Amino acid sequence: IVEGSDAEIGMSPWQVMLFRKSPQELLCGASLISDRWVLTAAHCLLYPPWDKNFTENDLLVRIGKHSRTRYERNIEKISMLEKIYIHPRYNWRENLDRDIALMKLKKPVAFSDYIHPVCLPDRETAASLLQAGYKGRVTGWGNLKETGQPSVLQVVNLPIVERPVCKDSTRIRITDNMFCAGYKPDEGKRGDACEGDSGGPFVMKSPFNNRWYQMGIVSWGEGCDRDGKYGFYTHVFRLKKWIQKVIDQFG
């Protein structure tokens, strides 16, 4: 996260760290959506241009974390993966269209003060909140700058951007399955996700029921926090039919 701040304890209890077994290292962010299911970006697991194609046994998920590097004894819980599901129409070739994946844990995780699931939006909440100017929150342990790394979880609040502005910021073909967020050059304030924040949640707090909803997944950006560029997020609601199909069929 670029130009963010340290998270408060328990501020994002759905935050998950995707952790490589060997060598032991951060792979990505992710989020907890139930006691058995974790949501992330497909490119965290499958990205052929970089020779990335992880299998279940390659990975761990660490839940309830705050420190990036410490083993947080008595607080974090570490889980093995039963199965990975990647969206069948995930477009890693062109533009990361449908950049979404689910991971089923081998065993349910116990909720605590530091571990708790985020809500997924229904159609109405998506329609109400996914509007230009409305702000969401992005969290992660990724790089602090494009070109170092944080001691603890970072947080930044960012406004959703008008679709035509998103489109005009890039040569990449944008789709309805993405939205973009970030400040404009003229707005002064700044901030963005960066490398290592991939797969983490873009969340919004509903003013209707005071619950946090995951509206986006950290997907891509041309660099990090560049003027005139924006961060692009997987549109969780647009892909929810797939999410529900996977959970209903395999869980």
């Binding site: 501020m11 699931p117 809500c119 609040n157 406004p159």
Partner: peptide, 28 residues
Amino acid sequence: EADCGLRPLFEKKSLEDKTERELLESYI
């Protein structure tokens, strides 16, 4: 689940985090 999106250390205790008001204020 029934309890999704309500944080034990915040919503469940009626405590606010330091910047959530920024989000609320943007929801015009």
